[PDB]
Each structure stands twice: as structure tokens, then as C-alpha cells.
Design a binder for this molecule. Structure first.
Ligand code: ADP
Ligand code: AMP
Length: 214
């Protein structure tokens, strides 16, 4: 099974990607996670993203397409995968099509602009695994600690209000058009498309996704 998660920053994509990985046994391919990791390690493919992410801007289509292709070509993706935060532009989607990377489900997480900044204020992450928490809405079992490793959680460098604002503008300019794009793909019978209400509690969004996917 191959899945794309679509939606504004803070919609709940990374959170639900974890559940889907656990339930359906497919890997989460998060271009944000990969680029952050590339910057941290100084990997030649992706270290270039540091300043661009800090500005809340999208990195080049070229760079992330390469990252995704490398990840996909590996073993653990042979039998399905979930793309979380990719594609982010129509050229990225077209590159998938040209490379014959079709998908089974596109899942649109719908959350009002107004919930985004406030929501992301509370985001804390465990960078080694990609696990995401919220100090109020989805807390770790021990305050400030990852549930698995017990390591102190961090705040993403791009998760401050001003940067989130810039990211949302970029989302509407470049990324929102993927809703139309994939809706048209679904009308052509190339994928299934479903929209979920991302304002519901984490557990309810999870149950809504299970109904669609199961
Ligand atoms: N349905 C939800 N209701 C409230 N908070 C949520 C929900 N889903 C995720 N969150 C929290 O809001 C923040 C953004 O969620 P995340 O899954 O990281 O969004 P995205 O990956 O789409 O940017 C995270 O801190 C997360 O813990
Ligand atoms: N598919 C992508 N295309 C372009 N830039 C990306 C992509 N994925 C992540 N980024 C960059 O990484 C940041 C964080 O992405 P994310 O973790 O999905 O929120 C974005 O604001 C961009 O700067």
C-alpha cells in the first residue's frame, strides 16, 4: 500500500503517519525528517537545506526528489510506503508520475489556518525516530521525554511563530494546488482520495483513517 498525506503544516500528518506505519507495516518517508537529518549529519544530499528551512521556504524540487528516490529504492519500501510532506509542489508530483511512482490513497488533512500557529507552539519531537508529541494535545508519558528512548524532546528549529507564518504562505502558494491535482488523479481512477477533518482529537482522526484504509 502506498499513501500520500496532504495538508497544511500542523494538520496532523506526521502524527498519523506513525499510526499507519505501526498498523499497516509500511515505512514513513518524511522529507522534512530526512532534510533535518541531512543537515544534522552534514550529508552531501540535503545539508543544503539548513538556511532554506530556517527561512520557512521550500527547498528545491530537485533536491527532495533525489532524496525520495534514494529512500524508495531501498529494501524496506519494496512493499509499500507513506509519503509524509512529499510531494510539496506540482513538479514533485509530476516527477513521481514520470518515474511511475503511483499511489493507492491520497489523504487530505483539513485544518483551518487559525489552528495552526497555536497548535505548532506545542510541538516537540524526537529527532532520532521522527516521533512527534504535543505538550497539551498529545503529551509524552513522561513530561519532556520520548516514550521509547527516554531522551529529552526538542523543538524543531523552524517551529517558531514567524517561521510557521512563512511556511503557511508557502503552503498555500505551492502545495495547496496538490489538492486539485490529486483530486483529478482520483477522478481518472489512478488513486483514491479522501479528506479527513483534522480538528478532531488524535484518536478520532486515527479511527477515521482506519475506516478509509482498512
Ligand atoms: N488531531 C490533533 N489534534 C490536536 N493536536 C494534534 C492533532 N494531530 C497532531 N497534533 C499535534 O499538533 C502538532 C502538529 O501535528 P503533526 O502531526 O506534527 O502535523 P504535520 O506533520 O501535519 O505538520 C503536533 O505537536 C501534534 O502532536
Ligand atoms: N517535499 C519538500 N519539498 C520542498 N521542501 C521541503 C519538502 N519537505 C520538507 N521541506 C523543507 O523542510 C521544511 C519542513 O518540512 P516538514 O517537516 O514537512 O514540515 C519545509 O518547510 C521545507 O523547508
Amino acid at each position: 500500500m502506498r499513501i500520500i498525506l496532504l495538508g497544511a503544516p500542523g494538520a496532523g500528518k506526521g502524527t498519523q503517519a506513525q499510526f499507519i506505519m505501526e498498523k499497516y507495516g509500511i515505512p514513513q518517508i518524511s522529507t522534512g525528517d530526512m532534510l533535518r537529518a541531512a543537515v544534522k549529519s552534514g550529508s552531501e544530499l540535503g545539508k543544503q537545506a539548513k538556511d532554506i528551512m530556517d527561512a520557512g521556504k521550500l527547498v528545491t524540487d530537485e533536491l527532495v526528489i533525489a532524496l525520495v528516490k534514494e529512500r524508495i529504492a531501498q529494501e524496506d519500501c519494496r512493499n509499500g510506503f507513506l509519503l509524509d510532506g512529499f510531494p510539496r509542489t506540482i513538479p514533485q508530483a509530476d516527477a513521481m508520475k514520470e518515474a511511475g511512482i503511483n499511489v493507492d490513497y491520497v489523504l487530505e488533512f483539513d485544518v483551518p489556518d487559525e489552528l495552526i500557529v497555536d497548535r505548532i507552539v506545542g510541538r516537540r519531537v524526537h529527532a532520532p525516530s521522527g516521533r512527534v508529541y504535543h505538550v497539551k494535545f498529545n503529551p509524552p508519558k513522561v513530561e519532556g521525554k520520548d516514550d521509547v528512548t527516554g531522551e529529552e524532546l526538542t523543538t524543531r528549529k523552524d517551529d517558531q511563530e514567524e517561521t510557521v507564518r512563512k511556511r503557511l504562505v508557502e503552503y498555500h502558494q505551492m502545495t495547496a494546488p496538490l489538492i486539485g491535482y490529486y483530486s483529478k488523479e482520483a477522478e481518472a481512477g489512478n488513486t483514491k482520495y479522501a479528506k479527513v477533518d483534522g480538528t478532531k482529537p488524535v484518536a478520532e482522526v486515527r479511527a477515521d483513517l482506519e475506516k478509509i484504509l482498512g
